[PDB]
Amino acid sequence: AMMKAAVVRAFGAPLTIDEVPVPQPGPGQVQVKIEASGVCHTDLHAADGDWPVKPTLPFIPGHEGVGYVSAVGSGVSRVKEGDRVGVPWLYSACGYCEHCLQGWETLCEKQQNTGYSVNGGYGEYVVADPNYVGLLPDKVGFVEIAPILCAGVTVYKGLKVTDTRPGQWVVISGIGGLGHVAVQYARAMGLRVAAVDIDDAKLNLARRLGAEVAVNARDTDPAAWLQKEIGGAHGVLVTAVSPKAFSQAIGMVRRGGTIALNGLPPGDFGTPIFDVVLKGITIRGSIVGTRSDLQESLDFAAHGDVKATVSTAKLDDVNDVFGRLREGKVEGRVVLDFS
């Protein structure tokens, strides 16, 4: 009846580790026992409450929780006790709005979000909607699979909406937490991959993961270089959306090409409409994804095509993890290990 969990009580404050009541599932709900729980920058923004729509205090963060179905409410048929599931950002949606009926539930105006508008996975247990959980692959461990619920589906869907075709070129801009996962999806999707970053080790990693071309933006203008070397990319996935990354993306793409934006930066970005219109460039926003996107993302992991860089930490130490993220001292993804 009691469990440990990291709670946000004041925006900007450190999280407190508490013993709170174990959530019980009602009709059409399930309870999940958390075995691992991914951490990412979205959790920082949730804890700082610096986005337009804020979480309601207090709340348990975490939209990358994975574990076992430990209890089942009435009317549940998709999963059963013992099943390995994840509880992603899309906690639930209404299921009958236009978006939901067309398989774009990720756009549902009535959606709830895990570890944001409802309690998430920074706890030993969590109550989820079984219609929206991710069904985890048998072959992949909890720690390794957790980031796929977030980083994985985000970059996979992002790549899909670049509208690129096997054999065509895609630039992965930024080979960090998201980017290094993106390279692997891109290669698995038959794309020729160009990696762009400012860190030579990250570029090497990209090459190892499948990138045929890699350019260090500190040593050379990536736009001019790529235009010359590959004739511009058919697609660009921008995983870290800084003003510079945005501008460079526009310069790197070939005529008729598409730029997909994964990040959520603040402010207005300078956009060369003249060039975009003239060059017939498309700019498209894409974050997370639908249930089908998620299952597809998980399958690539199961098949051995994608493996996130993961490092573990304990629930108790979640505040140290946050600190490391804030300072940009994390390489890969960090995952809380509950076992």
User: Residue 220, interface with a second copy (CB under 8 A)?
Assistant: no
d(CA 233, CA 242): 19
d(CA 122, CA 116): 11
Binding-site annotation: residue ranges for NAD(+)? 40-42, 45, 177-178, 197, 202, 241-242, 262, 264, 286, 288, 333
For β-strands 192-197 and 253-261, DSSP reports them as unpaired
User: Residue 244, interface with a second copy (CB under 8 A)?
Assistant: no
Cβ atoms of 184 and 305 within 8 Å: the answer is: yes
User: Residue 279, interface with a second copy (CB under 8 A)?
Assistant: yes
d(CA 32, CA 137): 16
d(CA 212, CA 85): 35
Q: Which does 150 bind (CB under 5 to 8 A by kind): Zn ion, a second copy, none?
A: Zn ion
What DSSP character marks residue 59?
B
**If 0-12 CB within 10 Å is exposed, 13-18 middle and 19+ buried, where does residue 311 land?**
middle
Residues that bind Zn ion (CB under 5 A): 40, 42, 93-94, 97, 100, 108, 150
Q: Which residues make Cβ contacts (< 8 Å) with residue 297, sequence separation at least 6? A: 148, 152, 153, 156, 157, 185, 289, 306
Q: Which residues make Cβ contacts (< 8 Å) with residue 217, sequence separation at least 6? A: 196, 197, 198, 248
Tokens of 295: 């299952």
Kindly report the number of other CB atoms within 10 A of residue 49's CB atom. Answer: 15
Q: Which does 42 bind (CB under 5 to 8 A by kind): Zn ion, a second copy, none?
A: Zn ion
Q: Which does 77 bind (CB under 5 to 8 A by kind): Zn ion, a second copy, none?
A: a second copy
Helix (H, G, I), strand (E, B) or coil at 104: coil
Interface pick for a second copy out of 10, 21, 81, 98 (rule CB under 8 A): 98
Helix (H, G, I), strand (E, B) or coil at 222: helix
User: Residue 316, interface with a second copy (CB under 8 A)?
Assistant: no
User: Residue 309, interface with a second copy (CB under 8 A)?
Assistant: no
CB of 181 to a second copy, least distance (A): 15
Interface pick for a second copy out of 218, 278, 314, 326 (rule CB under 8 A): 278
CB of 335 to a second copy, least distance (A): 24
CB of 207 to Zn ion, least distance (A): 26
User: Residue 202, interface with a second copy (CB under 8 A)?
Assistant: no
CB of 276 to a second copy, least distance (A): 4
Residues that bind a second copy (CB under 8 A): 27-28, 52, 74-75, 77-78, 94-96, 98-99, 101-104, 106-107, 109, 131, 160, 165-167, 188-190, 192, 231, 241, 246, 255-256, 261-287, 290-292, 295-296, 299-300, 303
